[PDB]
Amino acid sequence: QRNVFRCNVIGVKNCGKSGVLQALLGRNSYYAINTVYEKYLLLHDISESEFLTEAEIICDVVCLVYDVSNPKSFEYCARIFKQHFMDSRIPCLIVAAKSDLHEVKQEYSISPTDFCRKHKMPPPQAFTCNPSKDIFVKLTTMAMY
Ligand SMILES: Nc1nc2c(ncn2[C@@H]2O[C@H](COP(=O)(O)OP(=O)(O)O)[C@@H](O)[C@H]2O)c(=O)[nH]1
């Protein structure tokens, strides 16, 4: 019965990934850990690159992070999902980051809400560093399945 869970935080460069790790540590290093309700959630900051290694794919739960101010950020999340996680035993969560900024329409063929519903993912979770613990509990909860 594991109580320590690993989560890969994946998204476009400067989409607010490091903010998510710092938020878990309680703020407004590419790994961050803290207790979640007692469970331990270990986040991994996966920098944007050309491809992902099989060491960056394995985890207990995936946190796909896209930027609501960057219309090109969700396409990356959707592409990575279908390539590495759509055909996997790994639960996935999509987070609409920088929520406090204005939501410009994402340039993808499918809406985020539709895309999530299409692949049995929870609806897109809004998040900002300006911090709630909601996503980390859900990430941990989804890891406990
Ligand atoms: N408005 C807003 N800006 C943010 C938030 N989180 C991060 N940023 C800004 O986004 C920029 C890049 O974020 P960063 O953490 O470096 O993302 P990363 O490069 O993917 O790790 C930073 O200069 C932050 O000021 C947020 O929740 N709200």
Author numbering: 415 to 442, 455 to 463, 468 to 560, 565 to 579
Anything the authors wrote about it?
Both associate with Parkin upon mitochondrial depolarization and are ubiquitinated on multiple lysines18374546.
To better understand the difference in ubiquitination efficiency between hMiro1 and hMiro2, we first determined the crystal structures of the isolated cGTPase domains of both proteins to high resolution (hMiro1-C: 2.25 Å; hMiro2-C: 1.69 Å). The dimer interface is a highly conserved hydrophobic surface along one face of the cGTPase domain, which, in the intact hMiro1-BC structure, forms the interface with the second hidden EF hand (hEF2). The cGTPase does not mediate dimerization in the context of the full-length molecule, as the hEF2/cGTPase interface is mutually exclusive with cGTPase dimerization, and hMiro1-BC is purely monomeric even at high concentrations. Interestingly, although the same conserved residues mediate dimerization in hMiro1-C and hMiro2-C, their dimer relationships differ significantly. We performed size exclusion chromatography with in-line multi-angle light scattering (SEC-MALS) and confirmed that both hMiro1-C and hMiro2-C dimerize in solution.
